Write a protein that binds this ligand. Structure first.
Ligand SMILES: CCCCCCCCCCCC[N+](C)(C)[O-]
Ligand SMILES: CCCCCCCCCCCC[N+](C)(C)[O-]
Lengths: 477, 477
């Protein structure tokens, strides 16, 4: 019986008084009985004490836990228990039930949705989808690129960057929606049944299939039979060569909510993907005022929420490594508009060049990003020149988050071959009298157990300490 | 005695009443007596009639006219009369006097500053620098790329896009400031003298030179001796190979204005350029509160203007043609900040892909840009699919200027091999009840004489007719 723990803990004081605690954990229990196991758990506890009020927000749940078993001979996998639907045609909601679903040319499957951004401090970053916790551990200040996500992540993700000074900056990233294509002989499909979760739960079945026409083309369809909510979708997909693959989808919905009225709508979606084995992906989507996803409907029927009616959604992704002049470029953009509320443009860019000027690998990196700090836009840029000095490396950093700019000097030293490392930094925040910053971050990365602690302190500001451990153990008595 | 005329004329009516006239002209007189001639003239007249008031704004001037003569044997050219300083180290002001200045590896000289943007209507676009008229003729609605500029344009340009509906959108473009480098043996220099113009005029001399150190490097300097304004500048330049060339400059200023005070300041400037014979240029500049250019000083002493104190200026330019997947990409960006006023970010992007889907060269183009419409930001995007149909080509266009979006259908036919062409368009503006749009644009492009007329009419809107002729003639009695 396997366990995959992930822990976080942080303590901090204010220069005005307050203490606060933060402990979070998430992980997965696995078991083997052709009957396989998978239980995802996640929880957190937060406390704060000011002049008069302590506050506490505490949460725990099994996001999802189910049994799944492989079958030799339909190349299909059966899974039953509490899960989440993962579709290449429909969007996601959580459910209890079972499902039967069909390794083949990568150019047709989905890949790991690498999330990127920028942190003012040494910050804990949590990536989620719906309520499910996909990633939440600490990051050292500066641009960050989380490439630890489950091979099967789909849809758009919710990222929260909780900074050491108490500022929560949040944004959204859209994972690439790779064309649901197939090779002529084969057939891809996904037929799921059960009742929708967490709002007993309305009964629903959903099917989705991908036919292999005799050309470099392929047609797919799917339907959602939820009763008060039904949706049908058909789509055409086309394969190319190295110039990537492509596809388009039209999907209509019928939703009937009590004494409220009845909504009808469709949404068209065009997506292109040139990744295989430089990755580039561009996707588009435009949906009607009355078109709703299974999720949208549910929040509408059970929670009385009709907010966030999607209109148009553009999303571009380019991670191109020109080994040629020794520079990598990554772009993650996602513009999203609505019928009821204001547009929401989220992006993050970075370009890293490796130089030779005096000895090897002097590094200059420029990064820029925009997220949201409490409704209002938060716009950042980061400039870092790093000089490698033996097993260590000294660096200078210039940060510009909104109207507050930070200057940083620091030395980082690595050991155990890159597994462990330890860095000390000192700097100045100005943008409002200036403050001196002192900060140290330590990391240990063994494959069976990771661990990392960091301590930070701002003048007339805050002072906090945080640890973050994650590893693998077998819990069987 | 040569003449290079350029004319524009437009008439239009309002749906509420008004008529208006617009006539502009600019050109250059040339003459040969080793004594060469060059006279630039420019003028315009505008009239309007509403309920009660007609108005008229009329202007004419010889921007600049001077004599210049080549000399065999110092590979230098002497020019005297009323001109404008053009320096690779200093910024521009206009002056009466004479100058002596030093074809050689392109990687060190300057190129044609191609200006780009987007027009709602069939619009006349005027490009200028200081007050001097560099370009002003009509453009057919959609993205536009003016590549007619004098080989020697330097500094940043002022672009105004006067639309057929009466909306003036304006912005700024920074021409690439190519590194003032030289080959070891040779020496580049520029020593100018006279009095500053148009505010008799303060006396000034200015010198600038480029030495050829024995490496792929090169050092340059220059000074401005204006009396109440002095400035000295030194800079290092470095040449590479195909990875372009580079350079950095530090320049200090001393300005003394009466009973006002005395300003001191410097500004650092780093510029990289990878163009020769795909062009890419990135430049940076950061100047002190009290640092002033010769121009800045003059507006300060003679016009009592201390506005627009430059702080930081970033500028990027990328025009890369991937013949490989038959698509071109052009990016013109320029962020500019100040000490006294708000930031000013101007940009324009476009990507054009040529397809094959049914016959040859079906075209999809996406363009986006941001300029200023009366203090406020004006943000546009344009989508155009064009299908070639013999000597003609039918197209569909989607425009989005701010909150007003336009849909357009149109057929264009070309003849005389691309020299002449004629297109008719019809569309809808919605963003405020919608309106039908009818528009035709004709162009004739013979090398000795160009001419173009266009007629446009919006429902419950405006209705205008415009002509634009430009050619070469010899006026000698
Ligand atoms: C062995 C096959 C695995 C079970 C596949 C489930 C798909 C059946 C769907 C039918 C309807 C289910 N329902 C009505 C309860 O939602
Ligand atoms: C034949 C050489 C061409 C004339 C070059 C002019 C540079 C001389 C500058 C000295 C000062 C001129 N000044 C004081 C009137 O400005």
């Amino acid at each position: 019986l396997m366990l995959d723990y992930n822990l976080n803990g942080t303590v901090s004081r204010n220069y005005q008084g307050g203490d606060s605690h933060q402990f979070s954990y998430n992980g997965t229990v696995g078991g083997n009985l052709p009957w396989r196991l998978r239980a995802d758990y996640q929880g957190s506890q937060e406390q704060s004490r000011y002049n008069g009020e302590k506050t506490t927000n505490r949460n725990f749940t099994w996001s999802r836990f189910y049994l799944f078993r492989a079958i030799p001979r339909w190349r299909a996998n059966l899974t039953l228990g509490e899960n989440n639907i993962n579709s290449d045609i429909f969007r996601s909601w959580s459910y209890t039930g079972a499902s039967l679903e069909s390794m083949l040319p990568p150019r047709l499957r989905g890949y790991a949705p690498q999330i990127t951004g920028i942190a003012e401090t040494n910050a804990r970053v949590v990536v989620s989808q719906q309520g499910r916790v996909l990633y939440d551990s600490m990051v050292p200040a500066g641009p960050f690129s989380i490439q630890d996500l489950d091979s099967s992540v789909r849809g758009r993700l919710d990222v929260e960057v909780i900074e050491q000074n108490g500022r929560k900056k949040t944004f959204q990233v859209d994972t690439a929606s790779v064309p649901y294509l197939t090779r002529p002989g084969q057939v891809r499909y996904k037929l799921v049944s059960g009742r929708s979760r967490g709002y007993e739960g309305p009964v629903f079945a959903t099917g989705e299939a991908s036919w292999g026409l005799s050309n470099q083309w392929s047609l797919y369809g799917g339907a959602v039979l939820a009763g008060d909510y039904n949706a049908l979708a058909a789509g055409a997909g086309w394969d190319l060569g190295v110039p990537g693959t492509l596809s388009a989808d039209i999907t209509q919905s019928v939703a009937r909510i009590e004494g409220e009225r009845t909504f009808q709508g469709k949404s068209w979606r065009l997506s292109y993907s040139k990744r295989f084995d430089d990755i580039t992906f561009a996707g588009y989507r435009f949906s009607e005022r009355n078109y709703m996803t299974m999720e949208q409907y549910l929040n509408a029927r059970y929670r009385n929420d009709y907010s966030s009616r999607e209109k148009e959604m553009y999303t571009v992704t380019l991670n191109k490594n020109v080994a040629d002049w020794n520079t990598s470029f990554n772009l993650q953009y996602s513009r999203q508009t609505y019928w009821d509320i204001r547009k929401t443009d989220y992006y993050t860019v970075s370009v890293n060049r490796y130089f030779n000027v005096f000895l090897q690998g002097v590094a200059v990196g420029l990064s820029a990003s925009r997220s949201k700090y409490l409704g209002r836009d938060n716009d950042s840029a980061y400039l870092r020149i790093s000089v490698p000095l033996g097993t260590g490396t000294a660096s200078y950093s210039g940060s510009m988050s909104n109207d507050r700019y930070v200057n940083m000097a620091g030395y980082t030293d690595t050991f155990n071959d890159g597994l462990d490392s330890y860095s000390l930094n000192a700097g100045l925040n100005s943008g409002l009298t200036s403050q001196r910053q002192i900060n140290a971050y330590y990391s240990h990365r063994s494959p069976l157990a990771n661990l990392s602690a960091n301590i930070a302190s701002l003048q007339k500001g805050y002072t906090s300490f945080g640890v973050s451990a994650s590893g693998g153990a077998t819990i069987t008595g």
